[PDB]
């Protein structure tokens, strides 16, 4: 490991045209320094890949700001303006990625593994193609798909670049390397998977001030170190401590000792409900094991974000991981629940809820697995329940069961829909002409419940 | 995660005929309290996905003593002499699996993928089917491997390989809290991490259970969601397999010259492993021990010993300063890549090319490959052959004995000569020791070979 | 096989939304009399697998007037304005297919073949999706082909396209015996044949019955298996499309110059067309029609038109002795396979490596690629394209309107220049003409180029 | 097309390790002068794709005994002892490859394909790999699997040679070439599968012979011309014109109009019992529809042949078509009937019947197809009839009906057995001891019929 005092030295050779891997996930971990380096060289044409976007003037943004940029392969996009400008534009080139894949195609790219399959995006215009990646110039190709154990998975090829620009905790005098808390997301992953690895650290320690079994990025992964000079430690989204119904009805979906994974919006709501006599794990797919609630504003940490990049808190026992892990996690169907806002499911289980033009993020993985429940809550209706969905699908025959304000349906993907729990006033055929496709009646058929916290 | 207080309650049900994946290395890092537990529930037809076979009697070895084991998919597994009987009998069934493909196997089974390409195995009895699972009282192969898909990326060859997932994962793992979160010790984690992730249920046995909070979260080696089964183990009893305390000496003293400084390496048993003995002490050498450790010191002072610290050969080491622990799928993913600069070892043949055969021989050496495959299967790793030059031709044509890999082999250092390997090209001896004319190289080579116009004397190291 | 009397008997129990594979090539062998019966029945939204789409009143042309269609799959489908008018107009949708792709994937439909590669439309939209199915009635694209999978061989791109199956066909053939054999006159063979194959229910008409025993067994075109329903015919027409009977002067005369004895070509309408009017007697040029015939001859004397024989641009034609006719993919399998030597067709634009946009404007031409995009599809045949020199640049470093093939064109003749292309090199200056000089052509063309040392004056065919 | 008078001169420039497709179907259809000149030339180490392997002295027998081939792609080669031999010992490399697969393989070779999916041999060795090419020295590789319409296919590629040795009937002058009867098989696809194709005929006439309509491999295919100056009119098999129950139970599978595929033994006698008012028209892979019963001594013919190898006759209407055309017909459904001999069937329908070493010749693509109804007929004991087979897997899922001297099942791939015949005497418990395998039992259980012919 080469150790630098000047973050321009560190990444002056970087070639135009090169791609190159940047740590982050929101503006959490972010490498701040190395990315003010690049603006300094002027380096172009560069083929970036990044979870997000950064925001307008911060992280990628900067970058894009100057033109730096001339691909993207990101997984969530949105609250970057200028981003979308040169997008729309056919100024800039975009690859949406599922984000699970994206963790795992960058760890393949340092794994020596050339591709693998996974069932994300089986279904969907990841899959399919022709998604547009510049304005339509160039669209995006499929993927192969081939079967394992009587279900659907598409091929992935690796992701490797030509430097990687990583954002960490610290740095022992021999370049070994950890991540403090949310920050480590993708830093840990695509710290193997470039030919230059570049990290930029808060601060250099001795030698023997980690524990051997905890050296988060061993110094073999670390080619070039460097103390940032400058962190702004800013964060996004400063979050400090009909659709209640929908809200109270979820709030039952939760099951003690139960794993969960929650959307923004209504899911994530719906878990100020949980009884305290009841434990539940929420993960996190940016990397976290066991979500708190929000933090008082002194307790905001600019590492400690969940997946919608707002400021938490982690309850006792929690865990950080890389991204890689944490799709794994999700992919493996390790958690129990998967609970998520909707734009259209079918009468098989089909989910559209990613585009209309920000990107997948991680939804594409949490419905991937068979031996995840997941569960739907989106107003009723205009039809969001048909037959066949209208809007680009982000999995095939994985959603379980629906809540909206007025039923909850359980999912099946050969006999459809059944209608479980229907709202006090409503009759079964009140829910039939707001329903775009037949559905079966439960014979145990009850009032919705609502929790009574 | 649930609590047990005796081990046997914790793997009653485990049905027979099921799969179960044991962790440790060695005897590193094994759940010997679980498996003394199946001692006593007697279940059996068991596929056990090993990574060694313990030895005779301890670890896996028991429940092969109980005839527990129906089939074992294992890397290597020497050192168990009641194992062997079985396997030569046709009474066991084995899938011989490189090392670094049955950690990414296992990896792949809790990571929701059913297959993916690597290029270990590429070239050999792997890919190509043919390696025995089950013999013949003697009548050769009565089961043999089925090979594994082919296919090219980046103008590369790859093979296929499933994912493996067990019914249940038996786990040795250091400490637990309350919530049973798990980390592991030293050396002892290598493939009790990843199997964890790949059981539909996973039992962990650890040495000592802690309040919640004892792990800062962001080092909790295996988090609570993938632990189903927790227990204390009752006993420990901390075996240890191998105690080591701290014309050959021609290759040793050649091979050491092979170092340089901030290099990474990874040095097989033997000769390799000597030629580090030879490292100045102003050169800085990183040694990876691949069931998971960056960093390898010397073989420890009788009292420094640690049944949780072993290299590769399953010999007591210690480490450096600055050392790292990490899994077994980590550790192939860093050789596997390539992250590895130098990878020296031992060799029975090796070819023209670069083809090497040094992991079976007909029927006489059936231990299997280990780690041996993926150390050569990448490109950006140099690979460097040290053995005798003779026997009967070492170097030839075409090898004779089982491929470990395909043109993989860029230099190879016999007490004679230094020859450095090109895939097309073929031979070029570049170093010639003193007394030998390119003729006595010639007569004990076994095909043809460039001479470099900067032929030299072959080097010593001068320590 | 079952005989009808009635063409309405035969096809009454097609259903709405069916997929009906329709025979013929232009107007050459379509079963008008089969066509004329789905009049009567008024079946509709159906999925119409044909070629072409027959002109406006007559062959397909009649079921696309009454509304019948929902979807066509064919290859080109230009003098057809009823057809245009709804396509554009967002009330009828259609895959354009090249044709030689259009024939395998029938072909494969009826041979128990889900999918194959073939190199036709690799690097177009073909490959890449983006081709309008459905037009808005003036908001671009509402409905866009999706894109095919590539995957290399050899060193070469290939695309994944599927088998097409129909609920019928509807299939024109000459004769049939009394047990259901069938064969086909001349060129009206082109996609029946196939697509008797490709269907559950195979519906032929025929203009004669014969004994059985009319046929040498080694010459039935279609074996009675393949024919479920045969009719004969009540009326034919025999309707000729085009009645063809017996600057730019210069590329014609150079164009001719391409030509070698013994060579077998394929000449686009135009240009290429006509420079085979100057070719030597003493020279024998075997002329593929693509629409499959081998031995094209020269235009018929009026009293010489058969509406079973006509050339690829739908014109009546002869064939010289020792001509053959053969299938629709018969054709394409020999023309993909690359066993014409010489291609030579007009092109739009053209890149300095070779691409050739050939087959579609904007939104100003969209009749479809026909077989243009297999002509140019082999490594093994050489693609000459003849056109005017600039317009504004139709020789530049990218091309700006849909590629036909990418890197696939090997010289270019205008009437100022010659030019050899080579995949990666570039364009070769290697004929000039009279008057010209390097600069002018300079001047003339969007992209640089190299001069050969053995530049020469351009050529001109003395005939 | 080039016309030599001189069969070494129009193949002296084939070289060492050349591959050369070579033409002929048994002894019908070879091209056995210029076999006789490869002889002359010494040619060595061949790659020799063939559908089959002659006789001992004859055909591709020649050129094994010459020691001139290293290998083989062929799918049947019984009948030769020198092959079995040098194969066996590890002197000849061979790649059994199924009959209709090498066909179509010829054909992509020539038609710019490279590669393609079909459903024969998934799940048998062909697919998953392993045999032995060469002694094991080398083995065959795994063909991928990849799935379509809910079914399993594997992808084949193309094979192209460097010559083709065809022979056909007649050539006019301009070198059109025409094949005689069943003569066809291979010759016409490996026409248009190699850089140099030479044909030998028996009879080269004047241009304007054929109709333009009849010309079976236009000149643009034939690169070298030759007469053939010696013609043997070699036959291999002359055929002049507790089984019987099989044979009896065997003839009521036939129905009128019915188009059927019979293998050699009990399905083709079965068809002696075919009453003459009803029409059944057999097809014969090696090219013919309509064959007709053994000919008269006098009406032999060498150019007309069944599948096993015999003198053969057509009846009126007949058809000849090229190995390609027929394995096109047969893979893709339009024979309603296969029925054949077996070795082993599976509960659920696998079939073992090619390998205990001579080949599976078109075995798996006559049960290839869900379209065709398969039937196998076979003594019932050693069990036959098991849970699983344990001999090579011919197809899987396959057979739809057993008919054994005891009793007649129907197959089904998901609920298994259903006996639906028994033999008069025996009961249902004498069948369950004699299969190997659960069975149900039809509530209409008939006695096992006999046809009265
Ligand atoms: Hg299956
Ligand atoms: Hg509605
Ligand atoms: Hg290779
Ligand atoms: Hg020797
Ligand atoms: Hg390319
Ligand atoms: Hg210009
Ligand atoms: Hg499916
Ligand atoms: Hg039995
Ligand atoms: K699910
Ligand atoms: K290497
Ligand atoms: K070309
Ligand atoms: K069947």
Request: aromatic share 8%.
């Amino acid at each position: 490991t080469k150790f630098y005092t000047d973050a321009v030295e560190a990444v002056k050779d970087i070639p135009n045209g090169a791609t190159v891997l940047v740590g982050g996930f929101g503006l959490c971990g972010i490498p701040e320094n190395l990315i003010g380096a690049l603006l300094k060289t002027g380096v172009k044409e560069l083929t970036a890949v990044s979870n997000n976007a950064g925001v307008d003037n911060f992280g990628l943004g900067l970058l894009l700001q100057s033109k730096q940029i001339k691909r993207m392969i990101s997984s969530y996009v949105g609250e970057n303006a200028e981003f979308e400008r040169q997008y729309l534009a056919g100024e800039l080139e975009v690859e949406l990625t599922p984000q699970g894949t994206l963790a795992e195609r960058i760890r393949a790219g340092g794994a020596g593994v050339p591709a693998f399959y996974t069932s994300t995006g089986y279904g969907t215009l990841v899959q399919e193609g022709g998604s547009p990646i510049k304005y339509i110039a160039i669209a995006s190709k499929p993927r192969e798909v081939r079967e394992f154990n009587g279900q659907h998975f598409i091929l992935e090829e690796a992701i490797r670049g030509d430097f990687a620009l990583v954002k960490a905790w610290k740095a022992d005098q021999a370049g070994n390397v950890t991540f403090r808390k949310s920050a480590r997301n993708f830093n840990l992953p695509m710290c193997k998977a470039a030919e230059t690895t570049v990290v930029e650290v808060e601060e250099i320690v001795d030698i023997g001030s980690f524990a051997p079994e905890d050296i988060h990025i061993p110094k073999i992964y670390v080619h070039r170190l460097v103390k940032g000079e400058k962190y702004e430690k800013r964060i996004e989204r400063l979050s400090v401590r009909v659709r209640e119904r929908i809200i109270k009805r979820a709030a039952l979906e939760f099951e003690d000792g139960m794993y969960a994974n929650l959307g923004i919006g209504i899911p994530l709501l719906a878990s100020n409900f949980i009884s305290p006599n009841m434990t539940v794990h929420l993960q996190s797919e940016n990397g976290i094991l066991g979500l708190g609630p929000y933090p008082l504003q002194n307790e905001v940490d600019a590492d400690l974000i969940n997946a919608g990049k707002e400021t938490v808190t982690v309850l006792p026992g929690a865990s950080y991981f890389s991204s890689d892990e944490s799709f794994a996690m999700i992919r493996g169907g390790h958690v129990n629940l998967t609970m998520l806002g909707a734009m259209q499911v079918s009468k098989y289980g089909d989910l559209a809820n990613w585009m209309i033009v920000k990107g997948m993020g991680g939804a594409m993985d949490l419905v991937s697995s068979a031996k995840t429940k997941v569960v739907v809550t989106m107003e009723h209706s205009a039809h969001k329940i048909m037959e066949k969905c209208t809007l680009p699908l982000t999995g095939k025959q994985c959603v379980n069961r629906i809540i909206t304000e007025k039923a909850v349906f359980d999912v099946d993907r050969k006999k459809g829909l059944t209608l479980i729990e229907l709202w006090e006033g409503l009759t079964v055929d009140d829910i039939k002409k707001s329903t775009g496709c037949d559905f079966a009646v439960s014979p145990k058929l009850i009032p919705m419940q609502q929790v009574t916290t």
